[PDB]
């Protein structure tokens, strides 16, 4: 049957991985598929699991399993059309590009968007992925994806709705600046600014020579981890070397032009 094949695919996937979250999604997928009545759903789960088994990219596998869980938990592919379209966009961009940074940015932005279940984050990431696919500027694509990931991460972390609304103005500012040739270092500064705004903390910037020092005060340990994930991911995507210092509850992020 369809379900027995799906359970074997999930069983194989969950033993092959060392990633505990992929293991949990594989099991959730198998259980939801077991209870599924909709053959359209079962087809999508099977094709997601088969594709995951053929992949060596763990972010791609996470995205595919998230798709399978979403469709199977919903009962229909139509109920999750927007999330499905975001995942397809990311999967298309990931096979259309050879840059490992673009591949990783597309899949991670889509994963975070889907996990957020946040209307504004879903729409912003969908548009970012469309904009990246229409662009031939790989530098701009990498900046678009870094902004989209940081934004979706704020949503995943439960930023207040009003702080996320204001963070979207910084997404727009970053993308506009990138299109006008702004430096990778200034685009990283904008990702820092977006995170500081999204988390309700404060920042001061100090520039001397070719070094820019951003001092961020009032970060809790939970906020520290979210801000540094977005900022280090952005620095990896845009090829920026970043250094970090910590004293008390103060984080200092150093960028060199
Ligand atoms: Cl096999």
Residue numbers in the entry: 1 to 257
Which passages does the manuscript contain on this structure?
We set out to design protein systems that undergo facilitated dissociation. We show here that by explicitly considering excited intermediate states when designing coupled protein systems, a broad range of facilitated dissociation systems can be designed.
For both the AS1 and the AS5 systems, the crystal structures of the hosts alone and of the host–effector complexes closely match the design models (maximum 1.3 Å Cα root mean square deviation (RMSD)). Transition between conformational states occurs by a register shift throughout which the cleft could remain open and bind the effector.
